[PDB]
């Protein structure tokens, strides 16, 4: 029984908005640096990978509410600013959050009522960790094919709110897959 | 009449003649003459009791070696050069830790009490609580002793109540301990008299609700407001019914109750073997009940301690020693709560159970429709019935389940009457309403008035209850009156003070203040309450309070576990006002401009100070407003206060 | 007899009654349950680590200060400053047991006790008919705790050397699983380090007349009568559901169990037992009740 670790970093290509406060964005109540929750990653990934088609959705994330019980096989954790993004923004003196002013146009009236929505800065990097509990040897290839297709979809989609309006596009870089428990080889599994 | 009832009805009127003399248009002999015209109180031994409450009078009354008045003498002595000024103004005890005199007032009170005494008062075995209530209604601010040389802080109601209490305790102690010629037991010689003060004839008893917090704050459902006002009230009424039922057992009067509130109750009872045996049995039955429904959420512990009457007269400050000792015994008999067979029974019941009430976070209780148990639904019923109806009835059927196989339902005053002539074994508990005079009229005090949440604790209350006024005012009487004053403050004054505010009162009393409502309103009411309290405590006692902003539809069980001159004068009055005027005069300063101000301010840097200068320059405020803002921004204390004030603006 | 130190770096939900509840420390019940579940997932043998291992509850730490719970001992003097206090660090523990702690010292110790803060994070659930048609979202709340960069929790375990080697292997397995509630949603991973602190060892290896119960225990049937002779204790209804026992999770729920808290004081020692809370199931479900005694 082995535990596979999928680690990497994600870049904010266009501004990001999770906004649990709202319209603030989620942060840590002491460090005052924004975070991207694991619940967001998991929810959007599940919605995409399911809409792509089921039993596989049950297998990767686990539902256990339909008269049969399946334990989650993929664990997703939060992400945080890397040291690299922090140091770069400090040296070049860049704030960590941008605030976009927005506006709405009424019809038959054409009066504008403005908005104020906070957004994570472009170029910021988040470091993430996933875990894959391989409970069946003969299915790791299939499950990483599924997670590959899911990450491929998320590459071409958005996280958080207002993505149709132009924000949330992310990128995935520097993914490494290592086996941290047990004696299962993982030098052939692949994620972009 | 039962001789105990004779002690009661006589004692509570021993110093009645004072109001009559002080009247002038109208002491022992005078009171004797006054009571002597009325058919109901035409009992004669009560007349003897009243007419002979002092040493000189008793010297020649030639009364029997057993005549109730002697107990009255010792009781008044225990509860307590002599030029009484009829106009002496009563003083508030809170200073040492005056109220609103003239002659005609007393005449008016004479009229009023004759009116009530012809038309409201009547003599039967069970009307003593009613007599006590009318005394409470009429006398709470008529000074008891008006000695020019004493620190006058006792109302005559307090003096009478404690005298009646002590008289009851003495009577039981003497009747039980095989003494009958009380004239010779007590009065004969001062040395023998002094011994009687020294004999431990009194027991002080304590109570404590164990699991207040986790029972009141386990709510997650959509009726958060409706349940909380009702759950708190159910727990309160549980405490009240426990104490009343105990008093009924010990055959004692409602006077012996000295304090109720929160979870504590103090009772002064007799120091006999009979009383102690009953107390043990009643503790057994209560604990068995409370296990039979809750098993951890609520439990009651009682403890008692022998005390000698000499200690009640503040002889050696020993009142403080004995009071602390009983407190320690309570806090150390809440340790060993469950016997061996009990804990076995708790663990070996494999029972078919359903799951946790959505409203009431509890699994053990047995749910039903809408995922709610019967108890939670009864709580919801009483919640619905609270707002429109005021009287609360203890009966065999009811709606909610009370301790000793009783139940509560809700009625109206006409319905209460209809139950009264029905002669059902009832008690009426009211919504802060006197002038009831209906059956067992028991004006129980509870502040029923109807996001922001506010919690407050009296900082100096442990000492005040315990240390009190040092070395000279530490009787039972004076701590009792202090207790009554704090209780009445938190159980009437909140109701009145909260009127102009959009707030509903959840759980208030003792030293806990729990109010919830709109954000702005909570702040304004909190300031008003702090000031009005500092008025009533003459700036002797301080309050610490916390207010937080909580979003709607949060589980109120979770918001509760989260939760002066400086804030009023400096933040609210000056900075907030100038800021509000500034934004009112100049439009277009929406949340965007204010939030850029925040963005500059929270990062405490000088380059940000220059940037803020640029921003204020680009605004169109008057030079005074901009200048004041910038000068405040240069200073740390001022800038924090400015941040708080403008945050309040939004 | 080694002790384990836990660092988290991700906020953790630990739970008492509802998902919006937040708790800082957890008991040997949840810990032993986690070790059992990871042993079974590994497919290792369970007998060795069932009836030989003794685990203490979790207890927080700060930068270089370690903490143990307040003994419910009868101190004879305020009765206020001590009530607001929960934990007493290892430096001053013998001082507390012998009355060498003063009210101003109590205020100071309470003042220094900033070892984490609480929070409620909001979330929404759009699996509902928002997929299908006009239908409201159903926001829910979770309760979390976050530690400052030098805080965490620590264990105390004892047993044979072989048992501790197995415990090390299982802990290595567990550090990449969670130890809390919403593990799969991104809460509660940790890295652990084994350090030998001289002072805590000294405290654990005394000899006295009283005993301070550091875990949650319940005496067996035939010892409780003599166990409760002179004691000061708090009972806690410990409940919860079970993982993979029968068809419906909602229809499976452990029978409630009461055990003494993690600060009780006793005269006569009792050994505990791993008690079943099982019924209507396909496999036994274990709850832990075995004391770790501190003898002074």
- Provide DSSP, A9-50: EEEESS-BB--S------B-TTT--B-B-HHHHHHHHHHHHH
Q: What distance in Å separates the CA atoms of residue C176 and residue C281, rounded to the nearest whole number? A: 29
Q: How far apart are CA C23 and CA B246, in angstroms?
A: 39
User: Do B220 and C228 count as a contact with CB atoms less than 8 A apart?
Assistant: no
Q: What are the structure tokens assigned to B639, written together?
A: 């800038």
Question: Helix axis angle, B128-139 relative to B3-11, nearest 10°?
Answer: 10
Distance from C-alpha of B41 to C-alpha of B583, rounded to nearest angstrom = 71
Tokens linked to B439: 């059956």
d(CA C80, CA A75) in angstroms, rounded, equals 45
Q: Is A129 on the interface with C (CB under 8 A)?
A: yes
Number of neighbouring beta carbons within 10 Å of residue C237: 18
B596 CA: distance to closest CA in chain A (Å): 10
Which residues in chain B precede a discontinuity of more than 2.5 Å between C and N?
26, 80, 97, 100, 450, 563
For an interface test with B, give the residue of C79, C121, C279 to mutate (most B CBs within 10 A).
C79
C-alpha B161/C-alpha B135 separation (Å) is 9
Q: Which residues of A touch B599 (CB under 8 A)?
A: 99
B165-195 CB burial, b ≥16 within 10 A, e <16: bbbbbbbbbbbeeeeeebeebbbeeeeeeee
Q: Which among B519, B526, B520, B562 has a CA at the least distance from the CA of B544?
A: B526
Whether residues A180 and C247 touch (CB distance < 8 A) is answered with no
Task: Compute the nearest-CA separation of B636 from chain A (Å).
Answer: 20
Instruction: Locate the chain A residue with the closest alpha carbon to B596.
Output: A99
Interchain contact, B347 vs C141, CB within 8 Å = no
The answer to whether the CB of C293 falls within 8 A of the CB of C205 is: no
Phi, psi (rounded to 5 degrees) for C9? 70, 0
Determination technique for this PDB entry? cryo-EM
Q: What is the DSSP string of B191-211?
A: HHHHHHHHS--EEEEEEEES-
DSSP type of residue B360: B
Cα-based distances in Å from B454 to B223, B413, B506, B559, B631: 20, 34, 10, 11, 33
Cited resolution, angstroms: 5.0
Q: Residue A44 contacts by C-beta under 8 Å, 6 or more apart in sequence?
A: A154, A157, A159
**Of C286, C288, C289, residue with least CA distance to C245:** C286
Rama region for B43: left / alpha / beta (φ>0; ψ in -120 to 50; rest): beta
Residue B566: how many CA atoms within 13 Å on its side-chain side?
Answer: 5
The end-to-end CA distance of chain C, in Å, is: 19
Query: C221 and C62 in contact (C-beta within 8 Å)?
Result: no
The minimum CA-CA distance between C257 and chain A, rounded to whole Å, is 25
Q: Which helix (H) or strand (E) holds B332?
A: helix B318-333
Residue C69 pairs in a beta bridge with C87
Distance CA A52, CA C282 (A): 36
Backbone angles phi, psi at B508, to 5 degrees: -140, 140
Rounded CA-CA distance B44/B639 in Å is: 77
Contact yes or no for C145/C118 (Cβ under 8 A)? yes
Cβ–Cβ < 8 Å for A85, A12: no
Optimal mutation site among A3, A7, A46, interface C, most CBs of chain C within 10 A: A3
In CATH terms, the fold of domain B450-570 is Alpha-Beta Plaits (3.30.70)
Kindly report the number of other CB atoms within 10 A of residue B396's CB atom.
Answer: 9
Determine, for residues C233 and B336 on separate chains, whether the beta-carbon distance falls below 8 Å: yes
Residue of A nearest to C122 (CA): A20
Q: Where are the beta strands (DSSP E) in chain C?
A: 4-7, 54-55, 59-61, 67-69, 87-89, 117-123, 140-146, 152-154, 157-158, 191-194, 211-213, 235-238, 257-260, 265-266, 275-276, 286-287, 293-294
Instruction: Name which of C211, C255, C204, C243 is nearest C230 in CA terms.
Output: C211
Which residue is closest to A70 within chain C, CA to CA? C244
Is residue B352 annotated as involved in ligand binding? Answer: no
**What sign results for the dihedral spanned by CA atoms B291, B294, B295, B296?**
negative
CA proximity to B617, closest of B641, B601, B593, B599: B593
Shortest alpha-carbon distance between residue B296 and chain C (Å): 7
Determine the straight-line distance between the first and last CA of chain B, rounded to whole angstroms.
Answer: 70
Chains that touch C (3 or more CB pairs under 8 A): A, B
Alpha-carbon separation of residue A67 from B136, B230, C244, C248, C252 (angstroms): 65, 38, 12, 6, 12
For residue B543, what is the enclosing H or E element? Answer: strand B543-549
> Interior CA angle at B150 toward B144 and B152, to 5°?
40
CA distances from B120 to A182, B46, B131, B164, B549 (A): 88, 19, 9, 21, 50
3-state secondary structure of B477: helix
- Which residue in B578, B603, B555, B644 sits closest to B228, CA to CA? B555
The 3-state DSSP class for residue B94 equals: helix
Which residues 6+ apart lie within 8 Å of B49 measured at CB?
B6, B7, B9, B10, B11, B13, B14, B68, B69, B72
Cα within 13 Å of Cα(C71), Cβ side: 23
Q: Are strands A2-12 and A170-181 parallel, antiparallel or unpaired?
A: antiparallel
Residues of chain C with C-beta less than 8 angstroms from the C-beta of B344: 221, 224
State how far residue C11 is from chain A, nearest Cα, in angstroms.
Answer: 9
What is the separation of C-alpha A162 from the centre of its chain, rounded to a whole number of angstroms? 15
Residue B169 contacts residue B8 (beta carbons within 8 Å): no
Name where chain A breaks: residue before each gap, C-N > 2.5 Å: 22, 53
- Alpha-carbon dihedral of residues B499, B505, B510, B511, nearest 10 degrees? -80
As a whole number of angstroms, the distance between CA C24 and CA C152 comes to: 10
Alpha helices by DSSP H, listed for A62-131, are 83-91
Can you give the C-alpha Rg of chain B in angstroms?
A: 29
Rg of chain C (C-alpha set): 20
Give the whole-angstrom CA distance, residue B318 versus residue B327. Answer: 14
Crossing angle (nearest 10°) for helices B591-602 and B636-649: 150
Q: Where are the beta strands (DSSP E) in B210-344?
A: 257-261, 264-270, 300-307
Element (H, E) at A178: strand A170-181
Q: What is the CA radius of gyration of chain A?
A: 19
- Provide φ and ψ at B134, rounded to 5°: -65, -40
Residue of C nearest to B331 (CA): C74
Report d(CA B640, CA B570) in Å as an integer: 12
Q: How far apart are CA B313 and CA B434, in angstroms?
A: 33
DSSP B205-240: EEEEES-HHHHHT-B-SS-HHHHHHHHHHHHHHHHH
Q: Which residue numbers of B have CB closer than 8 Å to A's CBs?
A: 590-592, 595, 599
Query: Cα–chain-centroid distance for residue A123?
Result: 15
C-alpha B174/C-alpha A56 separation (Å) is 85
Beta-strand relationship, B428-429 and B441-442: parallel
Look-up: residue for tokens 């836990």? C6
d(CA B613, CA A93): 20
CB B46 within 8 A of CB B38: no
Strand partners, B233: none
A53 touching chain B per CB within 8 A: no
* Helices B156-176 and B476-488: angle between axes, nearest 10 degrees: 130
A92 assigned binding-site residue: no
Chain A positions in Cβ-Cβ contact with residue C249 (cut-off 8 Å)? 64-65, 69
> Closest chain B residue to A22 measured between Cα atoms?
B551
State both tokens at B471. 């070395």
The four Cα atoms B188, B190, B193, B199 give a dihedral, to 10 degrees, of: -140
CB B35 within 8 A of CB B47: yes
CA distance B383 to A177: 58
Q: Does the annotation flag A177 for ligand binding?
A: yes
| Nearest-neighbour CA in chain A from C152: distance (Å) | 16
The answer to whether the Cβ–Cβ distance between C173 and A181 falls below 8 Å is: yes
Q: Which residues pair with C192 in a beta bridge?
A: C6
Measured between alpha carbons, how far is C68 from C203 in angstroms, rounded to an integer? 11
Half-sphere exposure of B240 (CA within 13 A, CB side): 20
555-594 in B: which are within 8 Å (CB) of C? Answer: 555, 557-558, 562
CA-nearest residue of chain C to B352?
Answer: C255
CB C258 within 8 A of CB B347: yes
Is residue A113 within 8 angstroms of chain B, CB to CB?
no
Q: Report the first-to-last Cα separation within chain A, whole angstroms.
A: 25
**Which ranges of B453-602 does DSSP label H, i.e. alpha helix?**
462-466, 476-488, 494-497, 519-536, 556-562, 565, 576-585, 591-602
Distance, CA of B508 to CA of B494 (rounded, Å): 8
What distances in angstroms separate CA A163 from CA A17, A158, A159, A170, A182, one per listed residue? 9, 6, 7, 11, 41
Phi-psi label, residue C89: left if phi above 0, alpha if psi -120 to 50, beta otherwise: beta
User: Do residues C66 and C89 make contact, with C-beta atoms less than 8 angstroms apart?
Assistant: yes
CA torsion sign for A140, A143, A149, A152 is negative
């Amino acid at each position: 029984y082995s535990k596979i670790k999928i680690s990497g970093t994600i870049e904010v290509v266009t501004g990001l908005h999770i906004g649990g406060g709202g319209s603030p964005v989620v942060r840590d109540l002491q460090t005052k640096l924004p975070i991207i929750p694991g619940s967001s990653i998991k929810g959007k990934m599940r919605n995409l990978l399911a809409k792509h088609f089921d039993e596989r959705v049950l297998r990767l994330f686990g539902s256990s509410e339909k008269g049969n019980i399946q334990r989650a096989r993929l664990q997703i954790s939060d992400a945080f600013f890397s040291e690299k993004t922090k140091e770069h923004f400090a040296q070049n003196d860049i704030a960590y959050t941008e605030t976009k002013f927005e506006n709405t146009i009424n019809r038959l009236t054409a009066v504008a009522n403005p908005r104020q929505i906070e957004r994570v800065t472009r170029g910021s990097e988040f470091d993430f960790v996933f875990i894959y509990n391989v409970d069946e040897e003969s299915q790791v290839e299939d499950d990483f094919e599924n997670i590959e297709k899911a990450i491929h979809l998320l590459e071409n989609d958005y996280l958080g709110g207002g993505g149709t309006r132009g924000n949330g596009r992310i990128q995935f870089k520097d993914t490494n897959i290592e086996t941290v428990v047990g004696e299962y080889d993982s030098t052939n599994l692949k994620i972009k | 009449m039962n001789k105990k009832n004779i002690l009661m009805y006589g004692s509570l009127l021993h110093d009645i003649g004072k109001i009559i003399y002080r009247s002038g248009d109208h002491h022992s002999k005078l009171g004797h003459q006054f009571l002597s015209q009325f058919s109901e109180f035409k009992d004669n031994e009560v007349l003897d009791n009243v007419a002979y409450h002092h040493y000189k009078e008793l010297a020649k009354a030639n009364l029997d070696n057993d005549n109730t008045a002697y107990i009255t003498y010792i009781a008044d002595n225990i509860a307590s050069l002599f030029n009484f000024d009829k106009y002496t103004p009563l003083y508030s005890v809170f200073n040492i830790v005056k109220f609103k005199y003239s002659s005609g007032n007393y005449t008016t009170l004479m009229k009023d009490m004759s009116h009530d005494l012809e038309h409201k008062l009547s003599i039967k075995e069970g009307t003593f609580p009613s007599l006590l209530q009318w005394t409470e209604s009429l006398w709470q601010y008529v000074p008891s002793s008006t000695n020019k040389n004493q620190l006058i802080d006792i109302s005559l109601y307090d003096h009478s109540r404690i005298t009646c209490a002590i008289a009851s305790c003495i009577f039981d102690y003497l009747n039980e301990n095989n003494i009958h010629n009380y004239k010779d037991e007590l009065f004969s010689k001062y040395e023998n008299t002094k011994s009687f003060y020294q004999k431990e004839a009194f027991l002080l008893l304590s109570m404590d609700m164990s699991g207040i917090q986790d029972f009141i704050y386990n709510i997650s459902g959509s009726k958060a407001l409706k349940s909380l006002r009702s759950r708190s009230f159910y727990l309160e009424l549980m405490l009240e019914v426990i104490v009343d039922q105990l008093l009924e057992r010990l055959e004692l009067a409602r006077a012996n109750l000295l304090y109720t509130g929160g979870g504590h109750a103090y009772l002064l009872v007799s120091n006999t073997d009979k009383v102690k045996k009953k107390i043990t049995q009643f503790n057994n039955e209560l604990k068995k009940w409370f296990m039979s429904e809750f098993t951890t959420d609520l439990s009651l512990s009682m403890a008692f301690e022998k005390c000698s009457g000499d200690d009640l007269m503040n002889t050696s400050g020993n009142y403080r020693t004995i009071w602390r000792n009983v407190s320690s015994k309570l806090s150390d008999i809440k340790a060993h709560k469950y016997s061996a067979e009990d804990i076995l029974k708790l663990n070996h019941f494999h029972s078919y159970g359903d799951r946790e009430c959505k409203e009431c976070l509890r699994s053990d209780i047995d749910i039903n429709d809408d995922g709610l148990c019967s108890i939670c639904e009864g709580i919801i019923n009483i919640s619905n019935d609270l707002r429109d109806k005021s009287f609360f009835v203890l009966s065999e059927t009811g709606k909610l389940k009370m301790p000793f196989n009783k139940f509560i339902s809700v009625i109206d005053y006409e319905e209460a009457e209809m139950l009264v002539q029905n002669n059902n074994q009832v008690r009426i508990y009211s919504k802060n309403k006197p002038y009831i005079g209906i059956g067992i009229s028991t004006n129980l005090w509870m502040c029923d008035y109807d996001l922001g949440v506010v919690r407050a604790d009296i900082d100096n209350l442990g000492a005040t209850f315990i240390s009190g006024i040092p070395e000279k005012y530490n009787s039972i009487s004076r701590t009792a009156t202090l207790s009554r004053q704090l209780s009445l403050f938190f159980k009437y004054e909140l109701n009145h003070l909260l009127e102009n505010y959009q707030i509903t009162a959840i759980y208030s009393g003792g030293d806990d203040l729990f109010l919830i409502g709109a954000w702005d309103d909570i702040i304004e009411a909190s300031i008003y309450i702090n000031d009005k309290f500092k008025e009533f405590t003459l700036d002797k006692l301080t309050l610490s309070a916390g207010v937080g902003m909580f979003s709607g539809k949060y589980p109120v069980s979770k918001m509760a576990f989260e939760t002066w001159d400086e804030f009023k004068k400096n933040i609210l009055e000056e900075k907030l006002l100038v800021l509000q005027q500034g934004f009112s005069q100049t439009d277009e300063h929406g949340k965007a401009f204010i939030y850029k101000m925040l963005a500059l301010l929270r990062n405490n840097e000088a380059i940000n100070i220059a940037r803020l200068a640029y921003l204020l320059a680009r605004s169109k405020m008057n030079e005074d407003f901009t200048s004041k803002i910038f000068n405040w921004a240069q200073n740390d204390k001022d800038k924090n206060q400015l941040i708080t004030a403008l945050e309040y603006y939004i | 007899t080694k002790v384990f130190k836990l660092s988290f770096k991700t906020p953790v939900h630990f739970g008492k009654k509802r998902l919006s509840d937040g708790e800082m420390t957890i008991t040997a019940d949840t810990l032993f349950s986690a070790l059992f579940i990871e042993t079974l997932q590994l497919g290792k043998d369970t007998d060795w680590l069932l009836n030989d291992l003794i685990i203490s509850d979790t207890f927080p730490y700060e930068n270089e200060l370690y903490y143990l719970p307040k003994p419910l001992i009868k101190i004879d003097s305020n009765h206020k400053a001590f009530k607001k206090l929960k934990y007493v660090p290892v430096h001053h523990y013998n001082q507390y047991l012998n009355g060498e702690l003063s009210a101003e010292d109590a205020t100071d110790l309470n003042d220094i006790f900033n070892i984490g803060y609480f929070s409620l994070q909001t979330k929404v659930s759009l699996i509902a008919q928002e997929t299908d048609s006009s239908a409201d979202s159903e926001p829910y709340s979770v309760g979390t705790f976050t530690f400052e960069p030098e805080a965490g929790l620590y264990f105390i375990a004892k047993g044979s050397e072989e048992t501790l080697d197995h415990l090390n292997n299982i802990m290595t397995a567990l550090q990449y699983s969670g130890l809390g509630g919403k593990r799969n949603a991104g809460y509660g991973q940790f890295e652990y380090e084994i350090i030998n602190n001289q002072q805590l060892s000294k405290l654990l290896n005394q000899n006295g007349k009283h005993s301070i119960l550091l875990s949650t225990a319940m005496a067996k049937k035939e010892e409780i009568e003599s166990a409760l002779k002179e004691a000061r204790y708090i009972l806690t209804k410990r409940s919860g559901f079970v993982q993979s026992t029968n068809y419906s999770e909602m229809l499976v729920k452990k029978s409630d169990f009461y055990s003494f808290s993690s600060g009780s004081v006793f005269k006569n020692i009792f050994n505990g037992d791993i008690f079943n809370v099982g019924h209507n199931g396909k496999h036994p479900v274990y709850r832990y009740a075995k004391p770790l005694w501190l003898e002074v």
